Amino acid sequence: SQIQFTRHASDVLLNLNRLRSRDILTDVVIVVSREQFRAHKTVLMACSGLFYSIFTDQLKRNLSVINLDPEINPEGFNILLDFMYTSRLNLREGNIMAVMATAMYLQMEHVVDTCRKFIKAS
Numbered sequence: 001s002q003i004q005f006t007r008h009a010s011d012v013l014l015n016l017n018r019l020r021s022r023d024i025l026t027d028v029v030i031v032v033s034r035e036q037f038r039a040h041k042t043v044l045m046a047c048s049g050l051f052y053s054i055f056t057d058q059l060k061r062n063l064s065v066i067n068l069d070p071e072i073n074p075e076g077f078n079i080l081l082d083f084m085y086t087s088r089l090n091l092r093e094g095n096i097m098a099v100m101a102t103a104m105y106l107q108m109e110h111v112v113d114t115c116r117k118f119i120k121a122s
């Protein structure tokens with residue numbers, strides 16, 4: 001039975017976000033209407049059913065650009081991408097509906113569950 005390091009996973013994630021912030025080894029650009037966001041495909045797959053289903057497929061494995069659905073709110077996507085890399089979700093009454101629709105599209109069931117609880121507690 002192995003020694004558990006309770007802070008390790010959070011430390012790795014912090015460093016993955018630092019790599020994203022310095023554009024180190026990012027391998028995809030997500031185009032959301034007039035905005036673009038660079039990221040690591042590995043993190044996108046790890047956090048989203050949509051990105052998992054795209055990049056596990058050898059047909060799409062090597063794509064360097066992904067164009068999201070035209071109606072996806074870029075603010076909602078930006079908040080979710082930050083969530084992926086930080087474990088912190090920037091939810092408020094002013095963005096709840098946009099964040100919820102985007103998380104349903106991205107297939108992020110725990111975030112959708114949290115959005116539903118935010119509405120229930122409102």
Ligand SMILES: N#Cc1cnn2c(Nc3ccc4c(c3)CCC(=O)N4)cc(N3CCC[C@H]3CC(=O)O)nc12
Pocket residue numbers: 045046047048049050052107108109110
């Ligand atoms: N190699 C690999 C690899 C990389 N990413 N990834 C994911 N990503 C994934 C897929 C879907 C969702 C989310 C993440 C976020 C929440 C959501 O609504 N959907 C899942 C996964 N597995 C393997 C067993 C079943 C599943 C995990 C499980 O459902 O218990 N394998 C991998």
Ligand SMILES: [Cl-]
Pocket residue numbers: 047107108109110111112
């Ligand atoms: Cl989730």
